[PDB]
PDB file of C-alpha atoms in Angstrom:
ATOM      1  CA  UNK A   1     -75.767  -3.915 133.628  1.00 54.76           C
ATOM      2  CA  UNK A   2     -74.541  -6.862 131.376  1.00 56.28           C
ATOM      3  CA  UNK A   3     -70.711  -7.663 131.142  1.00 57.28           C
ATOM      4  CA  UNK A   4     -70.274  -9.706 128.055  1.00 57.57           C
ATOM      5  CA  UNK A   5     -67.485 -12.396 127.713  1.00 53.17           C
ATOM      6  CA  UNK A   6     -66.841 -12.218 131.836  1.00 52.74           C
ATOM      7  CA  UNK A   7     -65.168 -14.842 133.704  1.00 51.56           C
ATOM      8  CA  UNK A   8     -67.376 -17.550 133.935  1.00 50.47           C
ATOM      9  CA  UNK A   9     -67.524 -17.396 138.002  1.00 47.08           C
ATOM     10  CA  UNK A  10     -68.714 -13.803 137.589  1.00 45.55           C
ATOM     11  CA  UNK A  11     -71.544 -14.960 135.426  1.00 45.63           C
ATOM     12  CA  UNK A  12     -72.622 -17.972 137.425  1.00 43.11           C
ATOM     13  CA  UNK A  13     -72.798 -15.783 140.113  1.00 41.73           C
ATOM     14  CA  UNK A  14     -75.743 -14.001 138.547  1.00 40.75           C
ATOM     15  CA  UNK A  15     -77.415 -16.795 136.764  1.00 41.59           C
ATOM     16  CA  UNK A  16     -79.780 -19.481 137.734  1.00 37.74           C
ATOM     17  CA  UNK A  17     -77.677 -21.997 135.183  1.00 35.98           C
ATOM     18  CA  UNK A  18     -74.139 -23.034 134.144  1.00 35.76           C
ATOM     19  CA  UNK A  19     -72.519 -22.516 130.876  1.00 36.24           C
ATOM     20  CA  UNK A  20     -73.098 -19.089 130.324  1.00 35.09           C
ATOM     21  CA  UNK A  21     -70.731 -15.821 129.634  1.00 36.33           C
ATOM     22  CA  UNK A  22     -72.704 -12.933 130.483  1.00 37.21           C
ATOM     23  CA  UNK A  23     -72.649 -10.988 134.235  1.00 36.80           C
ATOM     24  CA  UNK A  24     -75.650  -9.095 134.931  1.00 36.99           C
ATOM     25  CA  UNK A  25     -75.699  -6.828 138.161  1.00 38.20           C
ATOM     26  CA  UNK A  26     -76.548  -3.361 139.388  1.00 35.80           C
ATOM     27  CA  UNK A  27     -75.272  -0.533 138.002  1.00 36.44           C
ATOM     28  CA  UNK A  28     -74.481   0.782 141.522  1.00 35.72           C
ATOM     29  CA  UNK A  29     -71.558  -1.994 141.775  1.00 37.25           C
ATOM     30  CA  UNK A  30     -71.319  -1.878 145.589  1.00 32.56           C
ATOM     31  CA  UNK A  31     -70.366   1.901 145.869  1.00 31.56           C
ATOM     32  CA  UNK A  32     -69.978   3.009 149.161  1.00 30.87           C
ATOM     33  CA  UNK A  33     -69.087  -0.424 150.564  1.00 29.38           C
ATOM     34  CA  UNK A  34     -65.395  -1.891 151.607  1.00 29.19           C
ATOM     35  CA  UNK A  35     -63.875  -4.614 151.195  1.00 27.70           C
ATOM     36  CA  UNK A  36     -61.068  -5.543 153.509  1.00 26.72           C
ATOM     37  CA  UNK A  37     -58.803  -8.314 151.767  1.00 25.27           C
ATOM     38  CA  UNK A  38     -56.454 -10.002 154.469  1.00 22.28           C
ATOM     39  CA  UNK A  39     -53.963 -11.708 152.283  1.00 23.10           C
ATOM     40  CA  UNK A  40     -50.289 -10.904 150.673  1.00 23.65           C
ATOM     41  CA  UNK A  41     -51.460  -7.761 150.218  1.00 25.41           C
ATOM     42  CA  UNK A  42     -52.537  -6.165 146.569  1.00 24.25           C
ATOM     43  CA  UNK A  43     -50.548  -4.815 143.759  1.00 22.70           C
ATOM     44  CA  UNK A  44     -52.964  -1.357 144.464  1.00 25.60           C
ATOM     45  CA  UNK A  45     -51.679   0.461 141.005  1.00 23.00           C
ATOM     46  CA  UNK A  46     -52.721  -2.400 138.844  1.00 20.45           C
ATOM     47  CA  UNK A  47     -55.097  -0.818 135.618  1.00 18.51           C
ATOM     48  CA  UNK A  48     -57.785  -3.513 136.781  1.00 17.56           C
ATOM     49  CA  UNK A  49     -58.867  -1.403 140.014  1.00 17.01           C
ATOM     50  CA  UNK A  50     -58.996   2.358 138.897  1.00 13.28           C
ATOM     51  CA  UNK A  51     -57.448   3.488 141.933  1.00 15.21           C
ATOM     52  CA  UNK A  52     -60.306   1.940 144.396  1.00 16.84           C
ATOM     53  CA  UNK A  53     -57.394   0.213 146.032  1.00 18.00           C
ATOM     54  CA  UNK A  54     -54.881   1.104 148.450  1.00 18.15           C
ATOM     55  CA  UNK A  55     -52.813  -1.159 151.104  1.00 16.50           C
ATOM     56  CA  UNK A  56     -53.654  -0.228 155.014  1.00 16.13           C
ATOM     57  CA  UNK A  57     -51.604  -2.243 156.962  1.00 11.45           C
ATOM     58  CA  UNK A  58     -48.738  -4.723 156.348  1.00 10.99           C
ATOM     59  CA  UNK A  59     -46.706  -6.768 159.270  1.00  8.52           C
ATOM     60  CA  UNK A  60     -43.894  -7.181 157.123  1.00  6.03           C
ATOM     61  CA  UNK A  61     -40.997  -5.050 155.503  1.00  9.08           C
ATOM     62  CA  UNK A  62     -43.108  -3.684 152.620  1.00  7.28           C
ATOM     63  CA  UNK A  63     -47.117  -3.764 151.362  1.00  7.44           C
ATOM     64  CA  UNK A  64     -46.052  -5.018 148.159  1.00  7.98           C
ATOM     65  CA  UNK A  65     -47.662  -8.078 146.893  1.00  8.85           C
ATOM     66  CA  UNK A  66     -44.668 -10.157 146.355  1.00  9.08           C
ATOM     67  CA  UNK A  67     -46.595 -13.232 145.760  1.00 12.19           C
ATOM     68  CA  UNK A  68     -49.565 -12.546 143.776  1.00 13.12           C
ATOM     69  CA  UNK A  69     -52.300 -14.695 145.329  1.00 13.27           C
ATOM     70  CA  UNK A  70     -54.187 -11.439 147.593  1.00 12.38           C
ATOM     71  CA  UNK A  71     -53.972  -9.457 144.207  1.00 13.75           C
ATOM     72  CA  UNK A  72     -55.991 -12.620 143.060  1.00 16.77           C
ATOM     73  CA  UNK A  73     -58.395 -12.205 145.549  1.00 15.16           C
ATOM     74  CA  UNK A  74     -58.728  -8.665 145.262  1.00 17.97           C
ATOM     75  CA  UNK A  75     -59.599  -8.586 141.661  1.00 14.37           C
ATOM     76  CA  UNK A  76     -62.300 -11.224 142.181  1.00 16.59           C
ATOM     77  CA  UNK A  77     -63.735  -8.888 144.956  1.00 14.90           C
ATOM     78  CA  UNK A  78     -63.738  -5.084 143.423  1.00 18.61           C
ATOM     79  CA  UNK A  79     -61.373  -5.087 139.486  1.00 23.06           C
ATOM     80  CA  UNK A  80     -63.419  -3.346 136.605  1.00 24.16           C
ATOM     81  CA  UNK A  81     -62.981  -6.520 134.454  1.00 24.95           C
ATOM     82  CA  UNK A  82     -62.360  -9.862 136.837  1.00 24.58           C
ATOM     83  CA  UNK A  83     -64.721  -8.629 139.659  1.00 24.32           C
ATOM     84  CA  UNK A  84     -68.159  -8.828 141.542  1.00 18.22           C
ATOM     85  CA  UNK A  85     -68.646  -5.368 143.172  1.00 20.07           C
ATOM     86  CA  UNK A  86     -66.944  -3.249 140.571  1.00 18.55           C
ATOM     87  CA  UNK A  87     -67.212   0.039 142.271  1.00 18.63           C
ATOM     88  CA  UNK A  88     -66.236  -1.089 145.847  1.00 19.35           C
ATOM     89  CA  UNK A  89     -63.400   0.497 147.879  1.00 20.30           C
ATOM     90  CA  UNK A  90     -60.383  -2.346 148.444  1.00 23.15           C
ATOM     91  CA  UNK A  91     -58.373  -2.432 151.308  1.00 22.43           C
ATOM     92  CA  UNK A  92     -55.216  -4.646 151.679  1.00 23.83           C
ATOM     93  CA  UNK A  93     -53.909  -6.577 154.661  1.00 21.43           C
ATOM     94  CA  UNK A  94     -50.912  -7.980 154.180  1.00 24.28           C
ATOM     95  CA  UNK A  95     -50.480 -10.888 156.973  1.00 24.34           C
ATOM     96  CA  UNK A  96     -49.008 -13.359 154.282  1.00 24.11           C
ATOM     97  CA  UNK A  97     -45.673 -12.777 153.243  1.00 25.23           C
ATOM     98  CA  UNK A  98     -44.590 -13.140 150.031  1.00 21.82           C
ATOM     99  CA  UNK A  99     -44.588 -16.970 149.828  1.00 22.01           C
ATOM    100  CA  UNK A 100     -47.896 -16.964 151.401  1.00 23.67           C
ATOM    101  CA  UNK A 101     -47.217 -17.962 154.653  1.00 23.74           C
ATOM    102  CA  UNK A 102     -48.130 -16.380 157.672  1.00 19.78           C
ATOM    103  CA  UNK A 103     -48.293 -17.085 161.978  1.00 19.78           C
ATOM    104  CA  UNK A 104     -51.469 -17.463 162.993  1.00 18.57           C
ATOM    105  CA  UNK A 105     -50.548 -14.362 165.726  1.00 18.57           C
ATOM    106  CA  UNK A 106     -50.091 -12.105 162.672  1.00 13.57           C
ATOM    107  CA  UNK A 107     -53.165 -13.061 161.129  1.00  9.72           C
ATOM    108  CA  UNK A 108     -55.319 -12.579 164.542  1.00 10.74           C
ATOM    109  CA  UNK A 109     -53.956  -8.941 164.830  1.00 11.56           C
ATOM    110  CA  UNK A 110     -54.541  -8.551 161.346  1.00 12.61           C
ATOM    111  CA  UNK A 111     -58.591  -8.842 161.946  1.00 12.70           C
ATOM    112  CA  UNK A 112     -58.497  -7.183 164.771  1.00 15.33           C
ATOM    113  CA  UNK A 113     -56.531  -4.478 163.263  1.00 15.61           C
ATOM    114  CA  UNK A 114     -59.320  -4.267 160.350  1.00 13.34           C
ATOM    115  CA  UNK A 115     -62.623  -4.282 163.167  1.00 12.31           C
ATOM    116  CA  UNK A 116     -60.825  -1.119 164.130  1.00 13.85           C
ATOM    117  CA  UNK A 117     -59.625   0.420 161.231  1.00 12.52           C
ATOM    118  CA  UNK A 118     -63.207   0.607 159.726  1.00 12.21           C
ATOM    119  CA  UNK A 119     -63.873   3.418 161.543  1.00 13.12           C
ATOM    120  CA  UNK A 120     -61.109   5.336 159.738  1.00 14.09           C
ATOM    121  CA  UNK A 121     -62.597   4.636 156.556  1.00 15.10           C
ATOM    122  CA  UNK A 122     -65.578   6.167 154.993  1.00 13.79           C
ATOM    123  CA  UNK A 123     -68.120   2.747 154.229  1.00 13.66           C
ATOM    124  CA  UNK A 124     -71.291   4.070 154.618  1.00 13.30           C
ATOM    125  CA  UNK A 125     -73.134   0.888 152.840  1.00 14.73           C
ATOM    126  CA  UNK A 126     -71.116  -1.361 154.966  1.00  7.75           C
ATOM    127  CA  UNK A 127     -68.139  -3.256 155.763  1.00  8.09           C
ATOM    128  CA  UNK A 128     -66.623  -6.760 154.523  1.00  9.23           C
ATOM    129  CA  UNK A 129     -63.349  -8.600 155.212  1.00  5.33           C
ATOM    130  CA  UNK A 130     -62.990 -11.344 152.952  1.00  4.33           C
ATOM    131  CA  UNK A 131     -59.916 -14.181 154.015  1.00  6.45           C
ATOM    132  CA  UNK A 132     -58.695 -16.270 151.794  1.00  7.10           C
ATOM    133  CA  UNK A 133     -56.490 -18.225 154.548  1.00  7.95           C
ATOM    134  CA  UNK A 134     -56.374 -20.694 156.800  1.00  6.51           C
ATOM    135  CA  UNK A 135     -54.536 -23.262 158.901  1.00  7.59           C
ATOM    136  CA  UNK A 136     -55.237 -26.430 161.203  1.00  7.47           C
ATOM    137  CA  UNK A 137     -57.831 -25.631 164.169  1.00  5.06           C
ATOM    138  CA  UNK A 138     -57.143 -22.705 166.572  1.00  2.00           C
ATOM    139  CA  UNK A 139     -59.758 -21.649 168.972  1.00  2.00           C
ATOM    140  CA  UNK A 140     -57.540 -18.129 169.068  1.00  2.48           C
ATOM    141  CA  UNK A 141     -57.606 -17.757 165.334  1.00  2.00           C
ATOM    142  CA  UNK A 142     -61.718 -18.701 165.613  1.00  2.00           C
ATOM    143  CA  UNK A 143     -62.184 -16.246 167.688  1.00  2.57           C
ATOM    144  CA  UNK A 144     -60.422 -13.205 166.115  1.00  2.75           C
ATOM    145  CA  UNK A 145     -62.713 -13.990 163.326  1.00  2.40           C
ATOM    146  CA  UNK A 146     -65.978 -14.075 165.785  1.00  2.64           C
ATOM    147  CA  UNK A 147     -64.853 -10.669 167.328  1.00  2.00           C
ATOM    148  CA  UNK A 148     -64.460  -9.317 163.750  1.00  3.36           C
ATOM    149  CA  UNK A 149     -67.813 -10.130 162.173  1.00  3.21           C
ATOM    150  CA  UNK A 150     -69.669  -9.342 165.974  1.00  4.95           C
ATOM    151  CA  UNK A 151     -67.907  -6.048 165.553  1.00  4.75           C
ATOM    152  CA  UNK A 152     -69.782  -5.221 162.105  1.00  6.07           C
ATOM    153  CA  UNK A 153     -67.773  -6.630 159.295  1.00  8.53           C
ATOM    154  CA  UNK A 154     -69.098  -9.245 156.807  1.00  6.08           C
ATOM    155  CA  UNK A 155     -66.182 -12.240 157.473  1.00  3.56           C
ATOM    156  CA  UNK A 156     -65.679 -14.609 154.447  1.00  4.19           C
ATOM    157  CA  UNK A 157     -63.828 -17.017 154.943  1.00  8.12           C
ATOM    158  CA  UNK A 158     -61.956 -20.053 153.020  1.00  9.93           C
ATOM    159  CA  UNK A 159     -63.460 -23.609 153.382  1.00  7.66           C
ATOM    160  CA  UNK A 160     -59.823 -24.527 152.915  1.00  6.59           C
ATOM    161  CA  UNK A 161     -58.445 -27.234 150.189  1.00  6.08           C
ATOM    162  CA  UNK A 162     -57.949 -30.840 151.756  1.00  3.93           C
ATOM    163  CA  UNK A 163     -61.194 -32.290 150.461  1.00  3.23           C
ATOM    164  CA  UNK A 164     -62.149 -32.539 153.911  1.00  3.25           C
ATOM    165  CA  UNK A 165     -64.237 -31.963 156.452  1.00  4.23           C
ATOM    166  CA  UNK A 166     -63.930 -27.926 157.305  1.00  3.75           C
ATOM    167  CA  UNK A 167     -64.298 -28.491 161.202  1.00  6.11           C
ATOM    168  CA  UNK A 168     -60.871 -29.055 161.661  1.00  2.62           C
ATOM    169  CA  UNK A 169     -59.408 -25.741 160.080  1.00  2.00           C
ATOM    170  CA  UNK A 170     -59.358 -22.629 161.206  1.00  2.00           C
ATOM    171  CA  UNK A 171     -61.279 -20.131 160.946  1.00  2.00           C
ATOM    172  CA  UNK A 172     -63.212 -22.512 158.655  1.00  2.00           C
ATOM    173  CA  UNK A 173     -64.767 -23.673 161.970  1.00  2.00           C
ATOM    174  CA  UNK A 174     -65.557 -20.985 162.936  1.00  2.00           C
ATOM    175  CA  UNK A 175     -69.470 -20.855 163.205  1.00  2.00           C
ATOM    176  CA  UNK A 176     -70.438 -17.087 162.998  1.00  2.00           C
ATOM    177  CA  UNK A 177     -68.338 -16.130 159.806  1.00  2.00           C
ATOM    178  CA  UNK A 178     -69.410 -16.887 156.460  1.00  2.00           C
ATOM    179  CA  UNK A 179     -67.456 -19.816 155.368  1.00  2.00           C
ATOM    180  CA  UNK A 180     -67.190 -20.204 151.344  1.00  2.00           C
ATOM    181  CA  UNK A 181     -66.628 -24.114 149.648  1.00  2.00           C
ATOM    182  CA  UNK A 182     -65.823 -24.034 145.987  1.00  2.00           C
ATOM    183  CA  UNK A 183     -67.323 -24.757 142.502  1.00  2.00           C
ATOM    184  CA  UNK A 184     -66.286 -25.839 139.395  1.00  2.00           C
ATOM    185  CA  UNK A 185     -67.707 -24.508 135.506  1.00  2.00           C
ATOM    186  CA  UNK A 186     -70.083 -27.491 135.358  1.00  2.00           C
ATOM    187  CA  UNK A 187     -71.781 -27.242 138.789  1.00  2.00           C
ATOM    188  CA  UNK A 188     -69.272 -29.665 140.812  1.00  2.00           C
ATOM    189  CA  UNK A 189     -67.783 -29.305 144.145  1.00  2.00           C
ATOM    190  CA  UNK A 190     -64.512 -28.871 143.183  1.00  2.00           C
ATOM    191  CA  UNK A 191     -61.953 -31.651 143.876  1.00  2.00           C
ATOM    192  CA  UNK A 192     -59.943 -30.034 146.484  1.00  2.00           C
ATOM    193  CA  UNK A 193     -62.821 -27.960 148.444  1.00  2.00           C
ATOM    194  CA  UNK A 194     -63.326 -29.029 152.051  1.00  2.00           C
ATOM    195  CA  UNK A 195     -66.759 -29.129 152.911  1.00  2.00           C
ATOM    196  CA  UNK A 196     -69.201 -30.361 155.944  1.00  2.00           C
ATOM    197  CA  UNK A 197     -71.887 -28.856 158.555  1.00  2.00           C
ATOM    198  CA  UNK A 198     -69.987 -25.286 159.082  1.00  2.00           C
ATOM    199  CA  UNK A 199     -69.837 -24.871 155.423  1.00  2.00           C
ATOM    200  CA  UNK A 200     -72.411 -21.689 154.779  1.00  2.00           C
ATOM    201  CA  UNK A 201     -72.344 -21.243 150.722  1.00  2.00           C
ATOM    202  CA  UNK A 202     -70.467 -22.140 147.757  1.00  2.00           C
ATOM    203  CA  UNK A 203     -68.804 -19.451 145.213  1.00  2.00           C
ATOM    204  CA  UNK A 204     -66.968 -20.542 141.757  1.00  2.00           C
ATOM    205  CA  UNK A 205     -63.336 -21.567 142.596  1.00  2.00           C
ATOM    206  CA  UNK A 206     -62.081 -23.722 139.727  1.00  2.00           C
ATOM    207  CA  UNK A 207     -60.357 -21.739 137.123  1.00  2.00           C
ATOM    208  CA  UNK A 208     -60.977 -18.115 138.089  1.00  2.00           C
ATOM    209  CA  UNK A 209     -59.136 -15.608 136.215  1.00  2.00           C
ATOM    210  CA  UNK A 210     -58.535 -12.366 137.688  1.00  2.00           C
ATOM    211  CA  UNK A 211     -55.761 -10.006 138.112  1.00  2.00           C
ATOM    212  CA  UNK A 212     -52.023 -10.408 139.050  1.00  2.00           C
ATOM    213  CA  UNK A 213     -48.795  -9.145 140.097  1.00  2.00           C
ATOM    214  CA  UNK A 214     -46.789  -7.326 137.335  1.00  2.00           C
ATOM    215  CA  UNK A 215     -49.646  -5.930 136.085  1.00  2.00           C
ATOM    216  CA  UNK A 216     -51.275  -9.464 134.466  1.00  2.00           C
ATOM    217  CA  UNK A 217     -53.783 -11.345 135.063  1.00  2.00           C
ATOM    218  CA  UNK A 218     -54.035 -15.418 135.515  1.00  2.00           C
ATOM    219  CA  UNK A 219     -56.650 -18.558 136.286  1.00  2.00           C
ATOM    220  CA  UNK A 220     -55.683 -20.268 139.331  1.00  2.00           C
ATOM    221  CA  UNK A 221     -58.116 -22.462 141.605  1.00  2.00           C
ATOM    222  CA  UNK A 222     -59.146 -22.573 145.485  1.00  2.00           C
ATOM    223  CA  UNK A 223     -61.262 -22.017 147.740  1.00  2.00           C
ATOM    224  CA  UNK A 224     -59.400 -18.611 147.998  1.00  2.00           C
ATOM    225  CA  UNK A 225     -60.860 -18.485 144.835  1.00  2.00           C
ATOM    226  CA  UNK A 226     -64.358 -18.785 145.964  1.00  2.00           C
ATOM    227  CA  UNK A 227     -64.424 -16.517 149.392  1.00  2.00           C
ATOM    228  CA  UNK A 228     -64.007 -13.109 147.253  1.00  2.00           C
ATOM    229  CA  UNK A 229     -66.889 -14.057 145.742  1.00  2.00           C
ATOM    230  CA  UNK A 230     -69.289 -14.033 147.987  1.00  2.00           C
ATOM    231  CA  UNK A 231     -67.432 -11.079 149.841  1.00  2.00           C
ATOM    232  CA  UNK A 232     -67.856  -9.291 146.741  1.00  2.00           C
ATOM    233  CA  UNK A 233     -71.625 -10.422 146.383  1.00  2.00           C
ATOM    234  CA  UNK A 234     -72.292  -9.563 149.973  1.00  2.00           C
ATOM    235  CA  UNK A 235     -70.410  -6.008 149.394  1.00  2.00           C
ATOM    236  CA  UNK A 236     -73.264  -5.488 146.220  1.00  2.00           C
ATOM    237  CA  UNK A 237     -75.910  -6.504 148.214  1.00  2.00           C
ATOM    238  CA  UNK A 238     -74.935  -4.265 150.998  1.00  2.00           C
ATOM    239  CA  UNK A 239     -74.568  -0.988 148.314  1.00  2.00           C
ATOM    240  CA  UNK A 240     -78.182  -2.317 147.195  1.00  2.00           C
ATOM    241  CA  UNK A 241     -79.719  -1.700 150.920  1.00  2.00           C
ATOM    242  CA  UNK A 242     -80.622  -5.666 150.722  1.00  2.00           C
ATOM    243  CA  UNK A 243     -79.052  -7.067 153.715  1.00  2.00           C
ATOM    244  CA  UNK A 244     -76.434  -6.230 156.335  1.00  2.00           C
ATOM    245  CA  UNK A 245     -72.820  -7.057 157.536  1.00  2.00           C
ATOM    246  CA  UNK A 246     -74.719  -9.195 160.524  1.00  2.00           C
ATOM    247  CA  UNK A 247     -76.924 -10.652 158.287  1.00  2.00           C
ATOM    248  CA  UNK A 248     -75.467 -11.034 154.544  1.00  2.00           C
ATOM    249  CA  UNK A 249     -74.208 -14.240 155.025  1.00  2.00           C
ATOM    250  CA  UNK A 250     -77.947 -16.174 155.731  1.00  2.00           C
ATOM    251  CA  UNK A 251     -78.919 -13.619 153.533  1.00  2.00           C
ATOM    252  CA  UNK A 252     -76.921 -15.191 150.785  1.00  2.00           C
ATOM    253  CA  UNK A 253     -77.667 -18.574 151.532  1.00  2.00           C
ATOM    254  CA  UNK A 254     -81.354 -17.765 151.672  1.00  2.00           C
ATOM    255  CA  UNK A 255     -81.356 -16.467 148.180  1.00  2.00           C
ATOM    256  CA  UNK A 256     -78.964 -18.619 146.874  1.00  2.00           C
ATOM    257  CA  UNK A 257     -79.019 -21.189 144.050  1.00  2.00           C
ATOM    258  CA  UNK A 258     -80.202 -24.458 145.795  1.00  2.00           C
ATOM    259  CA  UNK A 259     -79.630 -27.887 144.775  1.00  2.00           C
ATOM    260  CA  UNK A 260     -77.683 -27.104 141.790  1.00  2.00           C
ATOM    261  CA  UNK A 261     -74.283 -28.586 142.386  1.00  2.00           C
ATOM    262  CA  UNK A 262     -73.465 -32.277 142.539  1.00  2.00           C
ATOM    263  CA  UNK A 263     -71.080 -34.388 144.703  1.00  2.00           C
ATOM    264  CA  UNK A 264     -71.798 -32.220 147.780  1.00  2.00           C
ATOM    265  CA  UNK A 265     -71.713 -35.012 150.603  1.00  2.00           C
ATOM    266  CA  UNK A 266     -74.665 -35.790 152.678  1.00  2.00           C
ATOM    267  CA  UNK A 267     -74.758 -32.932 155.347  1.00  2.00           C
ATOM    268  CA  UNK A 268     -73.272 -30.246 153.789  1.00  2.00           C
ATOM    269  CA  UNK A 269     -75.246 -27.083 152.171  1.00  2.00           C
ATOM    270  CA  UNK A 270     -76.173 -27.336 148.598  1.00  2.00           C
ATOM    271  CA  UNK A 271     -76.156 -23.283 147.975  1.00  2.00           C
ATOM    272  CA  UNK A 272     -74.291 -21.390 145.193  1.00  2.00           C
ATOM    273  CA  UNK A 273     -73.777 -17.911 145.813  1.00  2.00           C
ATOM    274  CA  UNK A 274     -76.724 -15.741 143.393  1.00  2.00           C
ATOM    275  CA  UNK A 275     -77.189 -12.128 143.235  1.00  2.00           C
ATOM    276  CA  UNK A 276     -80.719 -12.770 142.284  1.00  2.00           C
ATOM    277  CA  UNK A 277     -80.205  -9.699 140.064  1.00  2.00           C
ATOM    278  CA  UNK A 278     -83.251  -9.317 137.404  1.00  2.00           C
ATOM    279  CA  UNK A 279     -81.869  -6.977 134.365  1.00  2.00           C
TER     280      UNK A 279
END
């Protein structure tokens, strides 16, 4: 399938250059999968996601997406227009409160909430929590995320955004999950994306437009930005019987674009997330 005029993330995703406007995937758009966004939660009755999206959990006085930032995220994962795996099922998480903010204790029940709550969902082609989050170093938070992706679930997770090295952020660090740097439209790290050994793959994260609350959609930049990507890739390659939740992060840096980016400092993975997908 060819998407004409998509963001350009969504077509760099899918290509083996820059500067093109076209994203090319399989039809079968990661149906059957789930993606678990742990964020502000999502503004579920937005247009973009056709009713594939629905709030679980929330630790706070409502699921609504006050802020706008895990809509963000979710549209970059699963919406018909701004999105990678346009036929996966979302699920929302709201840890962050509406100014995006969020204890570290209410973000470690929030993945352990989701390594149980898969199996009160139906995902037969597997199972992906993407979290675009993160704080300063916390063995606790680390290992929430380890417990989560040992459990079954595909963890993407946020490089963070202090042009820095990744080992001191949590769960950056943390070395089972798939941890996501950013991009920019011309092949560059982008400015403000941490980076480092425990960096697995890069995903588009300058100037990503997706959906937002009120209805609307907006460009905003991060390596929040980046992480639905690939949890979105990993949820299509999933649907398409390529890989697994244990597996679909080496699985995406094995296939990946490779040596295509520039300003990556010595020791840290050139890769940019590629669906490989031949029309």
């Amino acid at each position: 399938a060819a998407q004409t005029n998509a963001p350009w993330g969504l077509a760099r995703i899918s290509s083996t250059s820059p500067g093109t406007s076209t994203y090319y995937y399989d039809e079968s758009a990661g149906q059957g999968s789930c993606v678990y966004v742990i964020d502000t939660g999502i503004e579920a009755s937005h247009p973009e996601f056709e009713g594939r999206a629905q709030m679980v959990k929330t630790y706070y006085y409502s699921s609504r997406d006050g802020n706008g930032h895990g809509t963000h995220c979710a549209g970059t994962v699963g919406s018909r227009t701004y999105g990678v795996a346009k036929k996966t099922q979302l699920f929302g998480v709201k840890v962050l409160d509406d100014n995006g903010s969020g204890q570290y204790s209410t973000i470690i029940a929030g993945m352990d909430f989701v390594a149980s709550d898969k199996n009160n969902r139906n995902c037969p082609k597997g199972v992906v929590a993407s979290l675009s989050l993160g704080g300063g170093y916390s063995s606790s938070v680390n290992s929430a995320a380890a417990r989560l992706q040992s459990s079954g679930v595909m963890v993407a997770v946020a490089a963070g955004n202090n042009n820095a090295d990744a080992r001191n952020y949590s769960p950056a660090s943390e070395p089972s999950v798939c941890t996501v740097g950013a991009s920019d439209r011309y092949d560059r790290r982008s400015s403000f994306s941490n980076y480092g050994s425990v960096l697995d793959i890069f995903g588009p994260g300058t100037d990503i437009l997706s959906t937002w609350i009120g209805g609307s959609t907006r460009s905003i930049s991060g390596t929040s930005m980046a992480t639905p990507h690939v949890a979105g890739l990993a949820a299509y390659l999933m649907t398409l019987g390529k890989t697994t939740a244990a597996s679909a992060c080496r699985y995406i840096a094995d296939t990946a674009n490779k040596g295509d980016l520039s300003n990556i400092p010595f020791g840290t993975v050139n890769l940019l997330a590629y669906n490989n997908y031949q029309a």
